Ligand binder design. Structure first.
Ligand SMILES: Nc1ncnc2c1ncn2[C@@H]1O[C@H](COP(=O)(O)OP(=O)(O)O)[C@@H](O)[C@H]1O
Ligand SMILES: Nc1ncnc2c1ncn2[C@@H]1O[C@H](COP(=O)(O)OP(=O)(O)O)[C@@H](O)[C@H]1O
Ligand SMILES: CCCCCNC(=O)CCNC(=O)[C@H](O)C(C)(C)C
Ligand SMILES: CCCCCNC(=O)CCNC(=O)[C@H](O)C(C)(C)C
Lengths: 266, 266
């Protein structure tokens, strides 16, 4: 078997390949010592590593391993998955929404990093905890789906009131900008969580559409584990991408783009 | 006497002009009735209005007023202030960081809107309230000034455990992304608020430097009341603009750009 691993700040993504059969595994970065243990017990023909925690794995295993930069690996795996799933895109921004968010422009042949921002899944988890005391990711995201952002977020129409706004009225003008107007409100953990996902999604999307414009592409591919068990995030991002005239794409096993990619840079 | 009013989502900025010479005043948008009361008693030669709540003013006063579109008014007034303050910038991005944030490219002749985002002053107050239960603006902003983001934000160097990161290790990787690694103890209001100000600054700067690259300018002018009583915000923004190879500018009475521009539009 051949093994690729993308050991990130929060999740370890492990792909095992033998024959044309794949295994897609996810483990916590917290449990990296168990991954190393597991690896040390296997018969591995080829091990390729990428990610911020690649070094940790490499120093604790008993076999050589090639180490790749995660931007190249993500770009390589993503192209493999897009092709498999019938997306033949001439060029695209891809936004990798992990613990943090990294943006890339794929010109049809190779990637360049064109921005990043700290709004991503780590913010969903951290700010989400400060606002709900929930630490369990499934718990946090499930609850967020039951939330309403309306007493938290301010829209363009709330600011322009009964006059014609300069951009469409239903757009968010100020995330959390209605809070001071609803202090009669209680602010439910579900509503607060939905607003945190809301801001993360909007910021990622805004950045993605901006660079799409700059690098003259209409296609935006979103990957990263932050979309898992988070239909609200998927929806925020998808709707706003379409609204600004771009085409969003999600990819089956997109969160493993880097793990796959590592295998095929070797 | 001539009056220009920028009536936004949180604050109403008033410029009074007489012998070529100006007086600046702000009032809360929540106290708009008091602004209307003040206008109705005044003999005014020329009254010009802009911003979201210009409608509400115009429909409650008992005199005429001319209404101008805010994007144009802000551009006109910022060009006046820049020259009065000894700048000769051929072109620039301007980021108007109000209740929310609007971004513009000024080519030397006219402005174009080139994006926006809901991260700005409204988010600082609303998210800041949610994490701190402070509603008083000067109190909320003062509380943040000496906060420590270290237990709250995750940096690139935290994810890249002992290995060399592919981008600068001191960059924020995930705002709030260190929170789950610091559950042992309490998160103080100062530290949480410094983190709020940091995410707003970094998002606004990220957008501003992206569009500066896109439109080929190294100049970025930052306006809006969100910078008032918030030295930390100014610093987050200035430091990262400079690290991205751009030149940041703040303007005395920059928050009155629209009010001034309304007076000088024809
Ligand atoms: N089982 C899970 N546990 C924790 N976080 C998860 C899980 N599934 C998805 N997530 C989301 O995915 C994020 C990490 O995305 P990922 O793309 O794996 O990033 P990284 O490579 O930086 O670890 C988390 O910050 C969280 O928002
Ligand atoms: N006295 C104040 N009261 C409330 N907010 C203030 C005050 N001074 C500055 N601010 C900040 O300025 C932000 C609004 O900036 P401004 O440029 O006036 O926006 P708008 O035109 O949308 O009112 C507020 O959201 C708050 O962050
Ligand atoms: C100080 C403002 C800096 C905000 C910009 N930050 C970034 O570009 C890093 C965002 N994070 C990411 O790209 C990913 O989490 C990696 C893993 C660090 C590549
Ligand atoms: C659905 C996500 C939309 C995010 C983009 N939102 C915007 O561009 C509105 C940002 N706000 C502003 O530009 C200002 O607050 C005004 C006053 C609405 C012009």
């Amino acid at each position: 078997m051949k093994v690729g691993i993308d050991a990130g700040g929060t999740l370890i993504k492990i792909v095992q390949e033998q024959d044309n059969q794949r295994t897609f595994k996810t483990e916590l970065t917290k449990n990296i010592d168990q991954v190393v243990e597991w690896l040390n017990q296997q018969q591995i023909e080829k091990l390729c590593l990428t990610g911020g925690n690649a070094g940790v794995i490499a120093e604790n295993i008993n076999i050589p391993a090639q180490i790749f930069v995660e931007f190249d690996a993500a770009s390589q795996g993503l192209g493999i998955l897009l092709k498999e799933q019938g997306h033949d895109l001439a060029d695209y921004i891809f936004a990798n929404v992990g613990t943090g968010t990294s943006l890339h422009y794929f010109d049809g042949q190779s990637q360049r990093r064109v921005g990043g921002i700290g709004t991503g899944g780590g913010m969903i988890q951290g700010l989400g905890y400060l606002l709900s005391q929930i630490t369990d990711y499934k718990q946090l995201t499930d609850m967020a789906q039951h939330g309403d952002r309306n007493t938290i977020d301010l829209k363009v129409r709330h600011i322009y009131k009964d006059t014609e706004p300069p951009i469409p009225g239903d757009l968010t003008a100020a995330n959390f900008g209605h809070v001071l107007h609803h202090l009669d409100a209680d602010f439910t953990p579900s509503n607060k969580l939905a607003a945190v996902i809301g801001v993360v999604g909007e910021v990622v999307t805004t950045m993605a559409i901006t660079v799409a414009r700059e690098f003259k592409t209409e296609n935006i591919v979103y990957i990263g584990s932050s979309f898992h068990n988070n239909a609200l995030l998927r929806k925020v991002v998808e709707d706003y991408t379409v609204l600004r005239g771009c085409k969003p794409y999600y990819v089956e096993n997109g969160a493993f783009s880097g793990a796959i990619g590592a295998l095929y840079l070797e």
